[PDB]
Amino acid sequence: ANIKSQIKRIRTNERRRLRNQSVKSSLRTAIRGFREAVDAGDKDKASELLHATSRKLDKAASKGVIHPNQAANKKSALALALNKL
């Protein structure tokens, strides 16, 4: 770091890491809860958790933290697991 532009960029990148780590940790906790519900073996609560987690996943993906097709991928994989059980 020897230029004002680069130092300002590092500041901004640290800020946005704080933000993105928060959002991604929230998403991971949602997916973890969904996984716990599934290996416990519930149906209606599993579906409601699917609803909430999908809503927040879509919000995050639109915000741009993660990426659309893979978001659809794990959401549909989770739906497949639910319908399987």
CB 21 within 8 A of CB 47: no
69 binds, among RNA, Mg ion, none (CB under 5 to 8 A by kind): RNA
Interface with RNA, residue 3, by CB under 7 A? yes
Interface with RNA, residue 29, by CB under 7 A? no
DSSP conformational letter for 66: S
Strands, E assignment, the chain = none
What the block records as the tokens of 13 is 């990148």
Interface with RNA, residue 80, by CB under 7 A? yes
Interface with Mg ion, residue 47, by CB under 5 A? no
16 binds, among Mg ion, RNA, none (CB under 5 to 8 A by kind): RNA
Rounded Cα–Cα distance for residues 46 and 54 (Å): 12
Q: Which residue has the tokens 């959401």?
A: 75
Q: Coil, strand, or helix at residue 42?
A: coil
The residue ranges that bind RNA (CB under 7 A) are: 1-6, 8-13, 15-17, 20, 51, 54-55, 58-59, 62-65, 67-77, 79-81, 83
The residue ranges that bind Mg ion (CB under 5 A) are: 25, 64, 73
